Amino acid sequence: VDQATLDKLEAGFKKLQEASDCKSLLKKHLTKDVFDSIKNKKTGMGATLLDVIQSGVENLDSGVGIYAPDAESYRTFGPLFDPIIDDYHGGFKLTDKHPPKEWGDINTLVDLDPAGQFIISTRVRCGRSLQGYPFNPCLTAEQYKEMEEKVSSTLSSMEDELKGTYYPLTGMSKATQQQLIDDHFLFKEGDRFLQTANACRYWPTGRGIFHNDAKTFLVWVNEEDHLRIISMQKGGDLKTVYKRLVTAVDNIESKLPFSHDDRFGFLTFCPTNLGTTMRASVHIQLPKLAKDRKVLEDIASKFNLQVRGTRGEHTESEGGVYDISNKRRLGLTEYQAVREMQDGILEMIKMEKAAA
Ligand SMILES: Nc1ncnc2c1ncn2[C@@H]1O[C@H](COP(=O)(O)OP(=O)(O)O)[C@@H](O)[C@H]1O
Numbered sequence: 001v002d003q004a005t006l007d008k009l010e011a012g013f014k015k016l017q018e019a020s021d022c023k024s025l026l027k028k029h030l031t032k033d034v035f036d037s038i039k040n041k042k043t044g045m046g047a048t049l050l051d052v053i054q055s056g057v058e059n060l061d062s063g064v065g066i067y068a069p070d071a072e073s074y075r076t077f078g079p080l081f082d083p084i085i086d087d088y089h090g091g092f093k094l095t096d097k098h099p100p101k102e103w104g105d106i107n108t109l110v111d112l113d114p115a116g117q118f119i120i121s122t123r124v125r126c127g128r129s130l131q132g133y134p135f136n137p138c139l140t141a142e143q144y145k146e147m148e149e150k151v152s153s154t155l156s157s158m159e160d161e162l163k164g165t166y167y168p169l170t171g172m173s174k175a176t177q178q179q180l181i182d183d184h185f186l187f188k189e190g191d192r193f194l195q196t197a198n199a200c201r202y203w204p205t206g207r208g209i210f211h212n213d214a215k216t217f218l219v220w221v222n223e224e225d226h227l228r229i230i231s232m233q234k235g236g237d238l239k240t241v242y243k244r245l246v247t248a249v250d251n252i253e254s255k256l257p258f259s260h261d262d263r264f265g266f267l268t269f270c271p272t273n274l275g276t277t278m279r280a281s282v283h284i285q286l287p288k289l290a291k292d293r294k295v296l297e298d299i300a301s302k303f304n305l306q307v308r309g310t311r312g313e314h315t316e317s318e319g320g321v322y323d324i325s326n327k328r329r330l331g332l333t334e335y336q337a338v339r340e341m342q343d344g345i346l347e348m349i350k351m352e353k354a355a356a
Pocket residue numbers: 121122123125181183184185186187232279281282283308310311312313323
């Protein structure tokens with residue numbers, strides 16, 4: 001690695017060490033030994049440790065703080081990725097491998113909140129990376145557009161409930177984009193964490209959203225991951241939402257080659273999204289338990305759940321509505337990830353009813 005890069009790494013390391021109140025996984029795991037063992041390494045595409053950690057050095061409030069610029073990074077900088085992955089996913093040993101894909105028996109899911117007293121809406125998404133392309137920081141504008149054409153072409157073959165239309169982000173008026181974000185369908189722009197990871201270059205070229213007219217099946221193109229495949233609807237019918245995602249992912253997989261790793265499962269830009277890449281969530285109101293952000297988070301962590309704001313991560317709850325989802329994605333099956341969300345929510349509803 002060039003000397004300028006080395007100097008920036010040293011400054012980054014010092015900045016992390018000195019931030020006493022920083023709680024990121026990056027600060028916790030980038031010890032002097034780990035740092036010294038990988039700071040001189042570079043992947044075949046030229047990715048360095050600075051490309052990996054810059055977003056977390058610049059944003060000390062990061063929960064994790066690292067990203068993979070390319071697939072090789074996961075191993076080149078394994079001394080840093082491995083402990084962070086183990087910590088975030090609730091145990092992932094050096095000898096563990098992500099289990100084979102398994103959606104599970106959908107009929108076993110339990111009807112949530114039948115009276116409709118708590119759950120506002122349900123969503124399950126997965127992420128996929130196209131084989132043959134690196135992650136955001138290493139893409140050219142030309143690649144972004146080539147990928148956009150490939151994905152939008154494949155999606156034009158979706159049928160029946162999944163049939164839809166592609167909407168390029170350029171092309172959207174300010175009001176059109178705002179409404180789709182306000183309604184929780186479209187990804188927001190200007191995320192400081194992604195920007196500093198060099199993940200928003202050439203914005204909005206190559207970015208956009210595919211969705212069926214009902215907006216129950218959507219695919220984000222070129223935001224954090226190459227693809228985010230999403231199933232969502234109002235209410236609490238997790239079974240229907242999950243079945244639709246399964247159907248969509250099985251179909252798209254037959255049409256587009258995605259990157260998969262024997263140890264990490266499906267590859268993604270952020271290590272928190274490896275493995276199943278699955279985030280099953282509900283927008284839910286638990287007034288007696290959500291009397292405080294922190295108290296709700298501490299209850300949720302006991303069930304391997306994470307709490308986000310109404311407009312997603314790094315936002316606040318509005319009107320008492322929180323996004324609660326399974327935290328873990330690697331080292332457990334797809335069925336198990338959706339079950340951790342379902343089981344935890346079932347328990348949190350029991351706790352809310354008994355609270356007083
Ligand atoms: N259960 C849900 N119902 C409605 N919208 C949701 C739900 N879960 C997440 N969202 C929306 O998904 C969008 C992306 O939020 P984010 O936290 O970035 O999640 P992701 O993991 O999908 O990138 C935001 O508009 C957020 O409000």
